[PDB]
Amino acid sequence: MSLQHEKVTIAPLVLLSALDHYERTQTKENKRCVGVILGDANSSTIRVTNSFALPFEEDEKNSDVWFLDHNYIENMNEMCKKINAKEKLIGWYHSGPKLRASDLKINELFKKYTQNNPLLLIVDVKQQGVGLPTDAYVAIEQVKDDGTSTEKTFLHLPCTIEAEEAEEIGVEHLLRDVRDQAAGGLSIRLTNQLKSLKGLQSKLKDVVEYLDKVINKELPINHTILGKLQDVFNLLPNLGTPDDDEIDVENHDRINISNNLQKALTVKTNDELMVIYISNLVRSIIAFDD
Amino acid sequence: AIRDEIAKNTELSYDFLPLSNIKALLFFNNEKETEKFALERNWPIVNSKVYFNNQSKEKADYEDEMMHEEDQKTNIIEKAMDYAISIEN
Amino acid sequence: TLEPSTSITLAERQQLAYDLSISALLGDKIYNFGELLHHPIMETIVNDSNYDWLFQLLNALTVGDFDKFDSLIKVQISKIPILAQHESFLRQKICLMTLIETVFVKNIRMLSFEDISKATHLPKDNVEHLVMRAISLGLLKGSIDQVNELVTISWVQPRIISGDQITKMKDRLVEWNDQVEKLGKKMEARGQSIWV
């Protein structure tokens, strides 16, 4: 098993396919579609190219009770080679809104067939998230230095996408939106600028109330989270630094370029002002002549 | 009126005057009269020496206090917004 | 990762408890004093005379109390020469521990040498030695001006957490939530229509 990971890259196909398979098992209300996840690994970047359904039953009475049809998984993999002989198990997807604690026991079963720690890719079917509608975890077993026993736990990794160029234009072809969450002109990136700041608000809210929850409702004092929080402050500026004074000098510089650029545009349009007057001036004569 | 005029002026000119130098400038012939004006004009003369820089702060602070105050300070953020919208009008 | 199986006796549990405190007192990069206080082994083992004074020594480091530390050490450094032969590290440890905590709780990451003189209870020459030692271990990074007599800290090494410390970290986010919110509301209000 690879115990080295960094990122998860996801093909667009994977997400869409799990939503299709979800409605065709007709799953909802704690019955959640679970299929196998196919792709490349032994790589720090988990590259997920495809996904398929397995025959799976989820009991809603107990989620620690589940059905997985193990025999099917071997047969399906032989047909995966027929398509392309470089797709293997690298985990399993969940279709639910969020992480279950029965998902740790499920993850055990796919270890048997993987040369990499098994991936949990939550494909939402309500399409939440302010980035991608996918969350990503990989199960890691580690000692915890907080005085608590060895856990197997799902630790978060970033989500990214790797899309084939051939496929990507199909996304553009399908999509008739002119894009307001991706770069464009000034106004488009002006939305992108406000959108990012409003994203920071939402993310900043959740930390504050997690900290409240720890010392009154008694959620674990998790040192690893709070350590990254200490580094947020140390990497945070302080007023009266000559670096943040240099920002003032650097503001002057780019604004002045805008100031001259603005003048340049004003000149050019005043050439067209005079042109049109010369066009009206000739067309007085033509009218008068008729 | 003249006493008040020179008393505004001296904020800019000085930060330190002895009592003797204050007495001449405000056109007083009595020492108690100088100290009398200094209380009412709100000069902090302590140890026979004025600190006009305290007095400049007050007058500057009064100019800010009046609500106009967003665009009086003039926000870094606000300039860029203004520039942007005109182009996208 | 220790076994649920019982094959560790009380003797070993206490032998380890003592050693873990010995390592931390005579260390130079162990600010896991609270970690021992948040593991059962040493928190609940105070039930011999040896572990009366020892627990108080670990407690002395967290709060930054010099007077209590010195009184307990004064008795024990003689009895046990393991403290005696390693004394330099031991007394300088509580000065380093107080040094990192002061910077932590402030929102301005600089201390005067004069502030450190009071807080670590060193003369002014030896305050400059303390700064040098700390940077050499790699506890802290930043710069020194001896001509303003400041050390200006830019990065702090992570440390143990405690209920008090959570509220201190939480408040700072409350300000930044507020600043982000009203900054975005004003920018929203300008160019309302230019969100195409």
Side-chain angles (χ1 to χ4, degrees), chain A residues 113-175:
Chain A
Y113 326 125
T114 48
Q115 293 178 343
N116 74 295
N117 296 354
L119 189 78
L120 174 60
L121 196 68
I122 302 184
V123 183
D124 198 15
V125 295
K126 305 166 193 53
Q127 293 61 234
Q128 297 300 120
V130 299
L132 300 181
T134 65
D135 283 340
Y137 296 99
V138 73
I140 44 165
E141 180 195 27
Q142 45 189 30
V143 182
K144 187 86 174 178
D145 295 327
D146 289 18
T148 47
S149 322
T150 288
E151 51 203 47
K152 173 181 51 159
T153 186
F154 276 116
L155 191 127
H156 190 252
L157 311 172
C159 299
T160 336
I161 66 113
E162 273 221 344
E164 189 171 272
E165 304 192 14
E167 278 188 285
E168 183 73 328
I169 307 310
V171 176
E172 298 286 336
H173 203 180
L174 293 167
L175 184 71

Side-chain angles (χ1 to χ4, degrees), chain A residues 161-218:
Chain A
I161 66 113
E162 273 221 344
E164 189 171 272
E165 304 192 14
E167 278 188 285
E168 183 73 328
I169 307 310
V171 176
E172 298 286 336
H173 203 180
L174 293 167
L175 184 71
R176 305 341 293 154
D177 300 334
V178 290
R179 299 166 164 233
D180 26 339
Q181 46 72 47
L186 182 50
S187 57
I188 304 197
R189 291 181 312 143
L190 202 69
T191 302
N192 293 152
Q193 168 62 52
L194 181 53
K195 267 190 178 145
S196 291
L197 187 67
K198 291 295 179 191
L200 181 48
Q201 225 191 89
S202 301
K203 288 298 265 191
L204 187 50
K205 231 154 280 201
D206 301 345
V207 189
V208 174
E209 65 178 316
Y210 181 73
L211 287 158
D212 193 6
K213 285 164 180 187
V214 172
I215 48 167
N216 286 128
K217 311 172 191 82
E218 287 322 295

